């Protein structure tokens, strides 16, 4: 179900970050995630994986290229659920034809803003408002730490969308 499409995304983000940003799990981080609280979780085991790197712009491009690549592979009736995911997570009213750019334009214009590039706080914190899952097997997710506040901003943006799919 949802987990089948998030796992390939969490593994395309990882791969693209390793060939497009020369990253690794063994690589030091400019910014690390301190605490991952999920206000109201019910079946979401969200672990923070460290895949840090240096080109903050390439991290943002890699996650976007991974987010878009995973979107084309969706079925026509499945990619119809997405315009609700934006409107629920970012209140950006979009349509199936206008998603890919309006995601990019949000990510590029929000995650390169001075408010996220100049945080200077190395220990950051992630706050996801909602997430739901089954008791027997919870939806399993990951916050890939890119190492930068702007690249992690894109992950959080992508993360805010997927957690809004369970509802």
């Amino acid at each position, epitope marked *: 179900s949802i987990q089948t499409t998030v796992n390939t995304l969490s593994e395309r983000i990882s791969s693209k970050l390793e060939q497009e940003a020369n990253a690794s799990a063994q690589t030091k981080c400019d910014i690390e995630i301190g605490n991952f609280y999920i206000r109201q979780n019910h079946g979401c085991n969200i672990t923070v994986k460290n895949m840090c790197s240096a*080109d903050a712009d390439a991290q943002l491009d890699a996650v976007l290229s991974a987010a878009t690549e995973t979107y084309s592979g969706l079925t026509p009736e499945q990619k119809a659920y997405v315009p609700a995911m934006f409107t629920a997570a970012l209140n950006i009213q979009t349509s199936v034809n206008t998603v890919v750019r309006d995601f990019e334009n949000y990510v590029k214009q929000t995650c390169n803003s001075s408010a996220v590039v100049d945080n200077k706080l190395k*220990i950051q914190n992630v706050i996801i408002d909602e997430c739901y899952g089954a008791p027997g097997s919870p939806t399993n997710m990951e916050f890939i730490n890119t190492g930068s506040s702007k690249g992690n901003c894109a992950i959080k943006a992508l993360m805010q969308l997927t957690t809004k799919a369970t509802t």
Partner: antibody
Amino acid sequence: QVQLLESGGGLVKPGGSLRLSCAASGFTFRDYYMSWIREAPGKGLEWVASISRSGTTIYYADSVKGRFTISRDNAKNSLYLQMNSLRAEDTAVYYCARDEASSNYAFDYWGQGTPVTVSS
Amino acid sequence: IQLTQSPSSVSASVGDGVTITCRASQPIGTWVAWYQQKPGKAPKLLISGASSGTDFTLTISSLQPDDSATYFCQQTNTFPLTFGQGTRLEIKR
């Protein structure tokens, strides 16, 4: 004006235990990866452990893995390396450093050094 | 990962040049740092890099008798952080 004072080293018998401490002063401890490095008598500079700014991601070496434990208390500005199940190969002078998070990852300041000798 | 430092022992007089190389196995990138350990003293840093990586060099040129020490190289981005064999410099007299 930065310094890193090491303490806790000395003589123990094989299988012994020492908690080496590193008291920091002069910077924001919360913003630096703190590490521990061992120089064996005469020859060899070798890494032992490294801890993050929150203590959430801890990386060790393979020779000291499963035995040693690194930790940190950022309010008392200290770094510790608990050396359990010691052996003779771990006889060395142990340094603590501050990886340059704010600048270029590298050890800009090291510590004086606490000597550890493990013999029966 | 494994950094292979050469030459293990070099010696040139005051005012002349020495060349120390930290040839690596895997491409490490631009992340190499060089360290100086004065005899019997805690190691100190000299130079650093950041952003291939198979070969790297360090040339200390205006040699002073104060530069007699042991020099080490290190992978500063990827764990396990490994150092080099180490090169001892001796200033001639």
